[PDB]
Amino acid sequence: WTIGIINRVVQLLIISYFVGWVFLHEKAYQVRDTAIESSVVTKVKGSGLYANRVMDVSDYVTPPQGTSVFVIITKMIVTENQMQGFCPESEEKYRCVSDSQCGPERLPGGGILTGRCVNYSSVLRTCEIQGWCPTEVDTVETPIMMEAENFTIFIKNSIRFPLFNFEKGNLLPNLTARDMKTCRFHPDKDPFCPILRVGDVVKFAGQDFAKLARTGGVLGIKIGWVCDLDKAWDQCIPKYSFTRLDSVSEKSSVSPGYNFRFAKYYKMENGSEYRTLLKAFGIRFDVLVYGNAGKFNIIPTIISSVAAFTSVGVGTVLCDIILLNFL
Amino acid sequence: WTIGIINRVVQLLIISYFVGWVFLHEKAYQVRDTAIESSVVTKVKGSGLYANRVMDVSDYVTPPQGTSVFVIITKMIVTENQMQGFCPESEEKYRCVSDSQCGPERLPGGGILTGRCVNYSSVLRTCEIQGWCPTEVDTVETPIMMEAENFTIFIKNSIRFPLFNFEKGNLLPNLTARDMKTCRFHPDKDPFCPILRVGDVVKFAGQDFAKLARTGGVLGIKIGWVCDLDKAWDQCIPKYSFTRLDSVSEKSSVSPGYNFRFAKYYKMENGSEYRTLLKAFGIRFDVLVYGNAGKFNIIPTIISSVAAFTSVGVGTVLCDIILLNFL
Amino acid sequence: WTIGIINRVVQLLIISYFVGWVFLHEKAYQVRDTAIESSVVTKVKGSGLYANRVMDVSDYVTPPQGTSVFVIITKMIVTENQMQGFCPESEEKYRCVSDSQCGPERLPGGGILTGRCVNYSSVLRTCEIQGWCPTEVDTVETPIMMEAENFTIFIKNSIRFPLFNFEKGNLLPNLTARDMKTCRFHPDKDPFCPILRVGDVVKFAGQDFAKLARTGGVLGIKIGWVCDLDKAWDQCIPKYSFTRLDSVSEKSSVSPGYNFRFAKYYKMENGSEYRTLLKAFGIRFDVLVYGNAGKFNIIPTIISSVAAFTSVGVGTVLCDIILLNFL
Ligand SMILES: O=C(O)c1cc(C(=O)O)c(C(=O)N(Cc2cccc(Oc3ccccc3)c2)[C@H]2CCCc3ccccc32)cc1C(=O)O
Ligand SMILES: O=C(O)c1cc(C(=O)O)c(C(=O)N(Cc2cccc(Oc3ccccc3)c2)[C@H]2CCCc3ccccc32)cc1C(=O)O
Ligand SMILES: O=C(O)c1cc(C(=O)O)c(C(=O)N(Cc2cccc(Oc3ccccc3)c2)[C@H]2CCCc3ccccc32)cc1C(=O)O
Ligand SMILES: *[C@@H]1O[C@H](CO)[C@@H](O)[C@H](O)[C@H]1NC(C)=O
Ligand SMILES: *[C@@H]1O[C@H](CO)[C@@H](O)[C@H](O)[C@H]1NC(C)=O
Ligand SMILES: *[C@@H]1O[C@H](CO)[C@@H](O)[C@H](O)[C@H]1NC(C)=O
Ligand SMILES: *[C@@H]1O[C@H](CO)[C@@H](O)[C@H](O)[C@H]1NC(C)=O
Ligand SMILES: *[C@@H]1O[C@H](CO)[C@@H](O)[C@H](O)[C@H]1NC(C)=O
Ligand SMILES: *[C@@H]1O[C@H](CO)[C@@H](O)[C@H](O)[C@H]1NC(C)=O
Ligand SMILES: [Mg+2]
Ligand SMILES: [Mg+2]
Ligand SMILES: [Mg+2]
Ligand code: NA
Secondary structure, X not given: OHHHHHHHHHHHHHHHHHHHHHHHHOOOOEEXXXXXXXEEEEEEEOOEXXXXXXXXXXXXXXXXXXXXXXXXXXXXXXXXXXXXXXXXXXXXXXXXXXXXXXXOOOOOOOOEEXXXXXXXXXXXXXXXXXXXXXXXXXXXXXXXXXXXXXXXXXXXXXXXXXXXXXXXXXXXXXXOOOOOOOOOOEOOOEOOOOEXXXXXXXXXXXXXXXXXXXXXXXXXXEEEEXXXXXXXXXXXXXXXXXXXXXXXXXXXXXXXXXXXXXXXXXXXXXXXXXXXXXXXXXEEEEEEEEEEEEEEOHHHHHHHHHHHHHHHHHXXXXXXXHHHHOO | OHHHHHHHHHHHHHHHHHHHHHHHHOOOOEEEEXXXXXXXXXXXXXXXXXXXXXXXXXXXXXXXXXOOEEEXXXXXXEEEEEEEEEEEOOOHHHEOOOHHHOOOOOOOOOOEEEEEEEOOOOOOOEEXXXXXXXXXXXXXXXXXXXXXXXXXXXXXXXXXXXXXXEEEEOOOOOOOOOOOOOOXXXXXXXXXXXXXXXXXXXXXXXXXHHHHHHHOEEEEEEEEEEEEOOOOHHHOOOEEEEEEOOOOOOOOOOOOOOEEEEEEEXXXXXXXXXXXXXXXXXXXXXXXXEEEEEEEOHHHHHHHHHHHHHHHHHHHHHHHHHHHHOO | OHHHHHHHHHHHHHHHHHHHHHHHHOOOOEEEEOOOXXXXXXXXXXXXXXXXXXXXXXXXXXXXXXXXXXXXXXEEEEEXXXXXXXXXXXXXXXXXXXXXXXXXXXXXXXXXXXXXXXXOOOOOOEEEEEEEEOOOOOOOOOOOOHHHHHOEXXXXXXXXXXXXXXXXXXXXXXXXXXXXXXXXXXXXXXXXXXXXXXHHHHHHOOOOHHHHHHHOEEEEEEEEEEEXXXXXXXXXXXXXXEEEOOOOOOOOOOOOOOEEEEEEEEEOOOOOEEEEEEEEEEEEEEEEEEEEEEEEOHHHHHHHHHHHHHHHHHHHHHHHHHHHHOO
16 A cells, blocks of 8 residues: 555654754764863953052962962961971960870871970960961951952963864954953853953852952863864854852861961071961962864764664654554 | 676675775774873973073972973063052053042052152153052063073873773883983984973974063973774873964964063061062973873774664665666 | 574573673763863871971972972972072082083083183082082982871862763762861771871872982872762762872883972072072872763663664574574
């Protein structure tokens, strides 16, 4: 009967349409390179006020070279003119009643204990230690540099898909409005401007600059390069996203934020050495460049072809059995 | 007829040969690991002359630890003995006629304006600012360290393909001529020497050391590990390429080169603080290690097998139809 | 005969079982993301004694920001109060007999030779050089900071599989015993504690802290994220491994270890500049985060399906031919 081939022909048409759209949707004919090779060069701009001092890029940005991970210092704690010697630790955890509890068995991983129980103040008695004196007092409250909200981060990103030798950059004057220096990045109004406002980045990550500057934190400027190298060279475009990386988990057991210690080493006219100990709180920025490209290839196209051919050939039989049975 | 099977047998032989060479060429029987895990340790060697001073590795290399990204400083601008205070900015962009145009609305992202219009010199009148005084003069011309062309970069690279747990290194004494310390890297005469001459790297990237040292730049020493783990362990070999990463695009809108600012912080005998502000131009080197290995696997070999089997089975039918029709 | 279909049915059952277990074992139905996107934040804790000085985290850890690569300085060589000038190099390789062998042709890549042959001591005569004087004496023996064995490394690692947008962290209070701060990492007793003991890390890598601290070295804290995103979110877990990265190859031709030079720059009350030159030996730690996830996908499941269908269909024929023939 002719209808039998009109039922099968319709069967093959329809079933082949489902399979066809599926394989075409997932780019099953494409080999994929997911090992992007990126270089990131950053430039921070701005000036702030801390105490009665003025901070410029040389004072609060560390490191200076413009790497993919850098820190904008917003708050710090200074302990000036330290010098090697003996002094009572100011940490309460080092409280003692007699020299019998200031032995090596106590706080093994901590500082160097001299073995004497001394009076830091009239209200506390702590183990004496050898090291930089006086000791640090990290329980005080200090101001935060608010101007850092208006600082700008300029990100130059140069990536390359090696499997295809397809290299491109994120400096695109055509995609962003002229006076490029004057652009700033908005996810909607200017999603291709390489200049990021610090406060903006803090907002895009859903973070309060006050609490963040107070406790410090780690933010990530994410550059994504999902590209179809079958389309125009013009179509491979970077997409920026933002996130806070220092988990604020309720379970915690650890204080949130981000801070680190460094000293400025001075030597005396008399030749003795003394440093300024600095506890720095700021916003570390990690530029994380992900990307994967897909290019047509003969091998994946043949495998997907055979897959769809055989799969349809079975689906038509199964559909014929389902029909003849009628249920 | 016997010829019918001699035509089909020849058909199957030939068609199967096309498919066979294609799948065998693309290593369709191989699973691929494109997530190389590399460690890079670098060592720079050399000494230069700048002004009437001698620069050693401790003076021009930053950072010192020998990471995958480092900078060889070739030119710098010094502003010595700065101290917090008030002074007229030297940038022309800060020109003013009266204190009415030195308000917060002007240059919001710039320095801290005091609000006074002062006379930097007799020919210019600029807004006064609070910060490190005197201000920087980044419009002067300074020499460049030419000896940096003869510096050598030693790159230790240790990579690992985790999917196969196949780890190897780029220090290969057998592939490079003895007196290894005396080797230097030429793409043809010594393509496995880990010692790179700075000037050589500048040449391999097609760059002029004069202009590059003058304006600074970003070069990439690329280590590629394309390997067939089906062949001998001896065959997985690294291949070095070179490129300049700071786009010099005509569209530009940004000054090419690479520079960053850092200060040397001194404290006075009287206790006041003062720094030396340094604008550094140099050549940043980014070691970019790409790699992908292919090892025989049962799953990809079966999928490719089925693919070629079915594909030939259809190609022979299509070729039979093309022949019987004769066109 | 009915037995013919009982032989074929058993044939299809058995053969289909081999193929089925194979494809199910290799997760052939899974698409794989091998481009993990990780952020690493490290914190070192401890204090040591070197000479009659006390070293804290600000003195021996470099860089300070807590990156994925950092160095714990264990031994160092100090050359104090250097100043630009002329002096005889102390390296024996610079031995001379007359000013005729101190020309530019000698040691082209080395220091700046003045051209004079001078007497460093009564037993050696070396070329004079311009640079930081006095010169460094890197042939002396210095102590090593032993307390560094008891230091602790705290590693915060935040990764993300972008293909699935599946992000997770390595701070897992449920997997590690409470008093999290008090945990320390043992591969068996506490394989999820983020706090690493320096000495432990040195042991897990099969290295002697004595020789390592003496010569310096490069260790890698490896975080592996092999995950089946088909299983519970709870099952994607990090696994830590350890390795020494500075090859100690017998062929060598290079001194093992790891060291770098940096200076502390001082300026004189009289205004002249002088530095302290420091050769630092320590243990560099490189946090290397690998990972690959597998999630069920329609495309790979269909391709593997067709593969097994066709492959079984041929295996049954081949097995029938092998049986009928009987050999
Ligand atoms: O100044 C301080 O007093 C200070 C206090 C702390 C603290 O939290 O107690 C810290 C700190 O963050 N850690 C890390 C830490 C904290 C809590 C829990 C931790 O373990 C887990 C958390 C969650 C999930 C799984 C495990 C890890 C310390 C704790 C112990 C060991 C140790 C070693 C090295 C470095 C730091 C720290 C740092 C400092 C400092 O700057 O010197
Ligand atoms: O010392 C200086 O005077 C100085 C000048 C410039 C400058 O080019 O104008 C710069 C500089 O490079 N940028 C970056 C920049 C420049 C031009 C165009 C830009 O945008 C695009 C370019 C091409 C394609 C798409 C976008 C981005 C500045 C410009 C604005 C904002 C801003 C913020 C942070 C950092 C730097 C800069 C730096 C400095 C400095 O060292 O302090
Ligand atoms: O203080 C020193 O005197 C000193 C000595 C050496 C040394 O080994 O001779 C070194 C050093 O490690 N290298 C690297 C090096 C050594 C041996 C063989 C090498 O080549 C291969 C090894 C194995 C396989 C394939 C190649 C590479 C030097 C050697 C030459 C060039 C050069 C350039 C830059 C930097 C360092 C070095 C450093 C210093 C220093 O800190 O200043
Ligand atoms: C580490 O600390 C323990 C005390 O917990 C001490 O017994 C041991 O000697 C220390 N290790 C070193 C190398 O000093
Ligand atoms: C250097 O002077 C300071 C105070 O000015 C003094 O405390 C110190 O002991 C002196 N140095 C030495 C080595 O005595
Ligand atoms: C940022 O600059 C604008 C002027 O453009 C100013 O109104 C605003 O107060 C500044 N932000 C902060 C936090 O000072
Ligand atoms: C320290 O001395 C300098 C000049 O020698 C002087 O300008 C400065 O005001 C002094 N410090 C203080 C706090 O006055
Ligand atoms: C590099 O060294 C050679 C001697 O080997 C010398 O002739 C040449 O001038 C040096 N290059 C520069 C730029 O000084
Ligand atoms: C500064 O003083 C030192 C010794 O105190 C002296 O050697 C040096 O020459 C002086 N500076 C200048 C520029 O003369
Ligand atoms: Mg403390
Ligand atoms: Mg300026
Ligand atoms: Mg030497
Ligand atoms: Na297939």
